[PDB]
Amino acid sequence: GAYKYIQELWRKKQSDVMRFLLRVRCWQYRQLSALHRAPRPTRPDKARRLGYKAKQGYVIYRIRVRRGGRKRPVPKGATYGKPVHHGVNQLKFARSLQSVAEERAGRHCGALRVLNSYWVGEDSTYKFFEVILIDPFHKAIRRNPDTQWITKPVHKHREMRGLTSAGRKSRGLGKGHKFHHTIGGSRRAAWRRRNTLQLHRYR
Amino acid sequence: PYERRAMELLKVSKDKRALKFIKKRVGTHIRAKRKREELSSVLAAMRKAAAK
Amino acid sequence: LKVPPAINQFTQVLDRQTATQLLKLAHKYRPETKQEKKQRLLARAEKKAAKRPPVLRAGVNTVTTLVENKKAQLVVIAHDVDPIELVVFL
Amino acid sequence: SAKAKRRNTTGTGRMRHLKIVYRRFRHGFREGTTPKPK
Amino acid sequence: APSRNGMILKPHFHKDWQRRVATWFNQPARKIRRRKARQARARRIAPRPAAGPIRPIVRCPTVRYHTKVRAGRGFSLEELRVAGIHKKVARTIGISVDPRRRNKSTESLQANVQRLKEYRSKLVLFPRKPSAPKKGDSSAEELKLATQLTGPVMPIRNVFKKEKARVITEEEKNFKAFASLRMARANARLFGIRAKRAKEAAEQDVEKKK
RNA sequence: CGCGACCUCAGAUCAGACGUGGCGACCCGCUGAAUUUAAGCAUAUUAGUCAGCGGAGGAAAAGAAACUAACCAGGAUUCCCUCAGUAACGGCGAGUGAACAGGGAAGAGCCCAGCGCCGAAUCCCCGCCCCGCGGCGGGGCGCGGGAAAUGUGGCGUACGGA
RNA sequence: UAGCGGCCCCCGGCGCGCCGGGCCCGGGUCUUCCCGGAGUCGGGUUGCUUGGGAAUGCAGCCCAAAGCGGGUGGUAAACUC
Numbered sequence: 001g002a003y004k005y006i007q008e009l010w011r012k013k014q015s016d017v018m019r020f021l022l023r024v025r026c027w028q029y030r031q032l033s034a035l036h037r038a039p040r041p042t043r044p045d046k047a048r049r050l051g052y053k054a055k056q057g058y059v060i061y062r063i064r065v066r067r068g069g070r071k072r073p074v075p076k077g078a079t080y081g082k083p084v085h086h087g088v089n090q091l092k093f094a095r096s097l098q099s100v101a102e103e104r105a106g107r108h109c110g111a112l113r114v115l116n117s118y119w120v121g122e123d124s125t126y127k128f129f130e131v132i133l134i135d136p137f138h139k140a141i142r143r144n145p146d147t148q149w150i151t152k153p154v155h156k157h158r159e160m161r162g163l164t165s166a167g168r169k170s171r172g173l174g175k176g177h178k179f180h181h182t183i184g185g186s187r188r189a190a191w192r193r194r195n196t197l198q199l200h201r202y203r
Numbered sequence: 204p205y206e207r208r209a210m211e212l213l214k215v216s217k218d219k220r221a222l223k224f225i226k227k228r229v230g231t232h233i234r235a236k237r238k239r240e241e242l243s244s245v246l247a248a249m250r251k252a253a254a255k
Numbered sequence: 256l257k258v259p260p261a262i263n264q265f266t267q268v269l270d271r272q273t274a275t276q277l278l279k280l281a282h283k284y285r286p287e288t289k290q291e292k293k294q295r296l297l298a299r300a301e302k303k304a305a306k307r308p309p310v311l312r313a314g315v316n317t318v319t320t321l322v323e324n325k326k327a328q329l330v331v332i333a334h335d336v337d338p339i340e341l342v343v344f345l
Numbered sequence: 346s347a348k349a350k351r352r353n354t355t356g357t358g359r360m361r362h363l364k365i366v367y368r369r370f371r372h373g374f375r376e377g378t379t380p381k382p383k
Numbered sequence: 384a385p386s387r388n389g390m391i392l393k394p395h396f397h398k399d400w401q402r403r404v405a406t407w408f409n410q411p412a413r414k415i416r417r418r419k420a421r422q423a424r425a426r427r428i429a430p431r432p433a434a435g436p437i438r439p440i441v442r443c444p445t446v447r448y449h450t451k452v453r454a455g456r457g458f459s460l461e462e463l464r465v466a467g468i469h470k471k472v473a474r475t476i477g478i479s480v481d482p483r484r485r486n487k488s489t490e491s492l493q494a495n496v497q498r499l500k501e502y503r504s505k506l507v508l509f510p511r512k513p514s515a516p517k518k519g520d521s522s523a524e525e526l527k528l529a530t531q532l533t534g535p536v537m538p539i540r541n542v543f544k545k546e547k548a549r550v551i552t553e554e555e556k557n558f559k560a561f562a563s564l565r566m567a568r569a570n571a572r573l574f575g576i577r578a579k580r581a582k583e584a585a586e587q588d589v590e591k592k593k
Numbered sequence: 594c595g596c597g598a599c600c601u602c603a604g605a606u607c608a609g610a611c612g613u614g615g616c617g618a619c620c621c622g623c624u625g626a627a628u629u630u631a632a633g634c635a636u637a638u639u640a641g642u643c644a645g646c647g648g649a650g651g652a653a654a655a656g657a658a659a660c661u662a663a664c665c666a667g668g669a670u671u672c673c674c675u676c677a678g679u680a681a682c683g684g685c686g687a688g689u690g691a692a693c694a695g696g697g698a699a700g701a702g703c704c705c706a707g708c709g710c711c712g713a714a715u716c717c718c719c720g721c722c723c724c725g726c727g728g729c730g731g732g733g734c735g736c737g738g739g740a741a742a743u744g745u746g747g748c749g750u751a752c753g754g755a
Numbered sequence: 756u757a758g759c760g761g762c763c764c765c766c767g768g769c770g771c772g773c774c775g776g777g778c779c780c781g782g783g784u785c786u787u788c789c790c791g792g793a794g795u796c797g798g799g800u801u802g803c804u805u806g807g808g809a810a811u812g813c814a815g816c817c818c819a820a821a822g823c824g825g826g827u828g829g830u831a832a833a834c835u836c
């Protein structure tokens with residue numbers, strides 16, 4: 001099946017041919033606007049692996065992200081305080097740029113509902129992404145029981161709570177000795193549980 | 204391109220610096236080793252085609 | 256730009272006169288329209304009351320599987336698909 | 346300013362719709378019917 | 384400011400602890416809400432066993448505890464395969480399952496098999512449709528006697544075998560424990576070097592001799 | 594040139610739909626201080642805390658192993674007791690500080706893509722007719738209209754399977 | 756107020772008898788075939804954070820893989836089971 005061929009091809013990203021195609025895309029998108037709807041998927045494989053289904057009610061939004069770190073938002077240097085917290089320029093934001101992209105699209109298209117994302121290309125200044133969105137009221141989705149879990153009102157704005165593939169990684173959850181701080185629901189609830197006194201009746 | 208260049212080193216018989224070069228880019232010894240043996244075998248295929 | 260040969264190859268295209276003959280052939284072995292489908296199944300219902308011929312085969316995944324199966328003698332392709340990665344290897 | 350919060354909240358005003366929603370919930374949001382006349 | 388004598392100690396009352404205190408005046412009511420939900424469940428699923436499905440015998444890990452026995456997750460796939468039960472049906476009559484478990488020891492696998500056999504014997508199975516009893520079903524007396532089993536079904540009791548008063552041979556008198564111990568620890572420790580010095584001495588002897 | 598397929602992109606008070614704010618005790622994701630302690634202070638501590646911003650539910654989040662172990666082995670998650678003020682971190686000063694095994698509450702497991710078989714066997718909407726209609730559905734009929742080979746449905750998913 | 760005390764309305768709850776549709780699936784045996792998710796793992800490097808100390812986790816830049824393969828086995832490394 002061709003898709004398996006497609007897969008190892010897109011893994012051959014260093015090859016001269018793939019390099020050429022991505023190079024042309026990156027030029028093309030740089031000249032287009034920073035956020036717009038693609039009519040069909042750029043990567044059919046990535047979409048099928050992730051969940052995309054050639055049916056009504058699926059949309060794909062291309063978005064351009066500016067690259068680099070996070071300098072502290074402050075007037076001059078003048079971070080008033082101690083020389084420990086003087087640090088400011090070479091600081092790095094905890095979440096990726098990929099989740100940032102997802103966040104911006106989801107907030108713009110509020111009615112829609114964010115499934116997942118994949119990479120397409122990059123310059124120095126910019127990365128590029130393809131965000132898969134869904135309409136939760138078209139009957140194609142409502143009646144199909146595999147998908148009607150998204151229609152439920154809990155999953156509003158998933159990207160904002162970090163339940164997307166990117167959001168799960170920032171939470172630091174995992175099994176084993178490498179992921180002890182999250183035991184419990186999250187990093188926050190761990191701290192709560194360890195730093196509470198249980199004053200009993202009987203003591 | 205790096206694989207091509209490491210091949211040209213295997214042609215000029217500098218197997219240690221070629222290994223060094225791969226280890227420098229890719230990192231570990233095992234991955235570099237298995238990649239090197241593959242590149243030697245394809246050069247063997249060139250030896251076969253020149254033979255027959 | 257300096258275009259690599261594996262893409263340049265699509266510029267070599269089939270001539271007008273031979274292509275018309277190809278379409279002349281497929282016109283004989285066209286797949287059935289929807290309305291004829293209801294009427295053939297209706298006649299088949301009559302068959303129920305009382306072998307498919309060869310046809311074209313569509314879809315890349317179909318084509319390639321039955322290429323591995325070495326059944327197809329002739330493979331036609333379109334030159335102007337928007338992401339080329341689909342067909343390149345074929 | 347928690348005191349500023351309490352100066353301006355839901356309990357304060359009418360809540361002319363919201364107080365009666367509590368009442369409708371009390372009877373499971375019954376609708377369109379009536380009882381039988383005498 | 385320490386006067387003459389005490390335990391030097393580091394108490395952790397620097398964080399804002401008086402905020403996050405969990406008081407336990409709930410307790411008695413919580414006990415009741417559990418008790419009520421348990422009685423209502425047993426009232427719902429009336430004749431099925433209250434505790435749930437039977438769970439298998441398992442050896443404990445860690446040198447400390449490996450004498451004990453517990454309940455596990457569920458019966459293994461080999462125990463089922465060998466007793467001759469489709470796993471999904473086994474699922475349906477209230478038998479605990481977990482597939483992930485391996486089975487290295489023969490005594491465990493085999494004893495778990497025995498345990499299922501007694502269960503499979505005792506089980507009083509009802510028809511799907513009452514009108515037509517089937518082959519794999521229970522008799523009318525059995526349906527009459529069916530009733531809830533209170534408590535954990537087939538309780539795990541750790542038995543100990545009694546050894547009668549033996550006569551001691553003088554050989555048994557002779558055997559030397561302590562020496563055998565310190566000796567065996569030493570051979571295990573030094574095992575690798577005996578081979579290293581042996582390879583070096585044989586390799587040097589062969590090059591020097593030949 | 595003119596006409597016709599597609600592709601890409603606009604405008605419509607187009608026909609039908611949805612978002613937009615509030616509350617914010619409890620929850621989730623970010624950003625993120627100093628008073629103060631050390632008899633001083635600058636690393637540490639205070640603290641991933643107050644304050645700022647966004648998003649939710651009657652609960653949320655979590656979750657069915659890229660696991661623990663290294664014993665004759667255990668077997669999703671969540672919560673309680675104990676392991677423990679321990680192993681470890683630290684101007685080795687001040688102080689900080691877990692987990693696994695064990696006994697308990699509750700106890701339920703599953704699904705795609707792919708790889709492959711099947712005349713696309715799939716779907717949505719209009720129109721017409723019958724029933725029912727205060728959680729807008731069941732059925733029958735249209736050379737009625739589109740979606741879909743850049744892959745729709747059935748079987749089936751690592752416990753192997755056809 | 757007590758009482759397995761009474762009466763009257765609405766809503767639900769388990770049962771029974773019948774209509775109009777859909778679903779036509781299994782248990783074993785032997786023979787032949789089939790089987791996996793990349794800018795992701797991993798490495799160097801910087802800064803924060805964590806009890807994690809030749810770097811526990813997270814992120815940014817740069818490099819950039821494999822298929823009897825890969826990760827883990829709490830002191831870096833090579834060989835090895």
Ligand SMILES: [Mg+2]
Nearest residue numbers: 094623624641
């Ligand atoms: Mg942070």
Ligand SMILES: [Mg+2]
Nearest residue numbers: 386387388389
């Ligand atoms: Mg004293």
Ligand SMILES: [Mg+2]
Nearest residue numbers: 417420421699
């Ligand atoms: Mg209970």
Ligand SMILES: [Mg+2]
Nearest residue numbers: 606607608609
């Ligand atoms: Mg309108």
Ligand SMILES: [Mg+2]
Nearest residue numbers: 614615616617
């Ligand atoms: Mg609100």
Ligand SMILES: [Mg+2]
Nearest residue numbers: 630631632633
């Ligand atoms: Mg001080």
Ligand SMILES: [Mg+2]
Nearest residue numbers: 630631632633
């Ligand atoms: Mg002072």
Ligand SMILES: [Mg+2]
Nearest residue numbers: 631632633634
């Ligand atoms: Mg001072």
Ligand SMILES: [Mg+2]
Nearest residue numbers: 638640641804
């Ligand atoms: Mg800190």
Ligand SMILES: [Mg+2]
Nearest residue numbers: 640641689805
């Ligand atoms: Mg701390």
Ligand SMILES: [Mg+2]
Nearest residue numbers: 153649650651
């Ligand atoms: Mg609500």
Ligand SMILES: [Mg+2]
Nearest residue numbers: 154653654655
């Ligand atoms: Mg949830």
Ligand SMILES: [Mg+2]
Nearest residue numbers: 163168654655
């Ligand atoms: Mg989760």
Ligand SMILES: [Mg+2]
Nearest residue numbers: 175656657658
């Ligand atoms: Mg999981």
Ligand SMILES: [Mg+2]
Nearest residue numbers: 661662693694
């Ligand atoms: Mg453990």
Ligand SMILES: [Mg+2]
Nearest residue numbers: 703704705750
């Ligand atoms: Mg499934």
